[PDB]
Amino acid sequence: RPNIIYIFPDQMRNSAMGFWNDPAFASHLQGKADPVETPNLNRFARESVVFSSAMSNCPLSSPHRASLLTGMYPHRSGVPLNVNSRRPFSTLRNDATTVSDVFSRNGYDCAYIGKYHLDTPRHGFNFWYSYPHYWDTDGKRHDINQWSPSHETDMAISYLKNEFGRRDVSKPFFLMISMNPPHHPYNSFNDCMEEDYTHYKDRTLSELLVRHNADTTMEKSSSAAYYFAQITGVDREFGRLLEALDELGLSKNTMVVFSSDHGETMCSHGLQDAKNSPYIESMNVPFLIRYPQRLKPKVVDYLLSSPDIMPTLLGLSNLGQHIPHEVQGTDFSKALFSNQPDKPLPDAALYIRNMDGRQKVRTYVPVARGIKTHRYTLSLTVDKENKQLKEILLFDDLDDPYQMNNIDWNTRPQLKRQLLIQLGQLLKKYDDPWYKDGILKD
């Protein structure tokens, strides 16, 4: 029955949403909220289920998208590394059953808009508009200089109104929108609309970077206003979509999910090249579900993972009996619908980091694995050539939200037992390469 709109911008961390500053929400976000302007997401959060601890296990664009569409982790999804010609083996498995595959096979219209690029140089999607370079359902190339989130919202809205007859309105739809603001140039503020930047000019770095781990002396620190301004612009475009949903008869019977592929530390821990790291600024992503008829507005601390989105989506659409059987994710629909009447709710989520070994790269090395629980963060890194322990990251995220006190785990052996058992259980339950190769049998 229900329509589904899944909107996810790039590089938006969970802390960068204004309503995390309010008393009814702040106690659930790890650390201080970002001083960002997101009025539409603010109103949206009060009518939706807000996930405080949704995680991107592999905090990279391509691995998350593969895990989002397949409900499986980067070793089973086929994308453990960022999709690139120089890693031909990293690609969405053609013989995989995606979330759109199930929906389209169950009488849905399926539309994808934005950055895809999960194939090295469709899956039931009737409507295709990939991302200065866009491609139609026909293969038509469209070069438009309009700010990319604006153009993708326009195409999303026209699809919703059926302005051009690209969908059968007598069917439900599953519309995926990946909003792609342009950080590829960074430096110059050109890729920003005045309407959104105007909130962050005349703001000091101390006013912009409010998280205690933020290095306010970097060259990247001048980009903070740029980063927040595009988030504001994406929220503004998200509000346009919500108003469009209201002007049609769609708001009451549409499940609207807002998320992101990964976060952005943004000078947290003084991090240049701020991507693919176990820090909460890089792993915690937004996750909000507005299901007006079937979901009551609340805040949940579920450890949601990328492979968990597809089964949960299918479950929330009364399609829980059609989830493919090698889908490793967890269906949170029964927990979201009812009043906590289930036991096997995940206690921790995986963190995955891999890299290449060249000569043109055909294999990847599982150099880092870890778990994020309700209270703790653990991440273990090993040598590339000899899988021996190289680094240990342990943070008490309740007392150290900004992850500034790397606890030595030998000082707390009781916690070391708990977390190492949990990491092993997670690594085997999903059959991680750290299990195939038995990495760190220690």
PDB file of C-alpha atoms in Angstrom, residues 43 61 63 72 87-88 144 170 172 235 294 312 344 365 395 417 423:
ATOM      1  CA  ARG A  43       9.550  20.219  11.957  1.00  0.00           C
ATOM      2  CA  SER A  61      29.799   6.463  -0.444  1.00  0.00           C
ATOM      3  CA  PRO A  63      29.967   0.644   0.098  1.00  0.00           C
ATOM      4  CA  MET A  72      24.328  -7.059   2.976  1.00  0.00           C
ATOM      5  CA  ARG A  87      39.298  -1.674  -8.475  1.00  0.00           C
ATOM      6  CA  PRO A  88      37.242  -3.611 -11.047  1.00  0.00           C
ATOM      7  CA  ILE A 144      22.482  21.593 -16.390  1.00  0.00           C
ATOM      8  CA  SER A 170      -2.522   3.727  -9.776  1.00  0.00           C
ATOM      9  CA  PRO A 172       2.604   2.734  -5.259  1.00  0.00           C
ATOM     10  CA  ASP A 235      17.161  20.782   4.065  1.00  0.00           C
ATOM     11  CA  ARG A 294       1.540   3.492  11.253  1.00  0.00           C
ATOM     12  CA  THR A 312      13.291  -2.628   7.661  1.00  0.00           C
ATOM     13  CA  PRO A 344      17.010 -10.104  19.278  1.00  0.00           C
ATOM     14  CA  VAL A 365      42.530  -6.183   2.649  1.00  0.00           C
ATOM     15  CA  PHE A 395      36.131   5.128  23.792  1.00  0.00           C
ATOM     16  CA  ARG A 417      35.981  -9.477  27.499  1.00  0.00           C
ATOM     17  CA  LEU A 423      32.945  -8.208  17.995  1.00  0.00           C
TER      18      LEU A 423
END
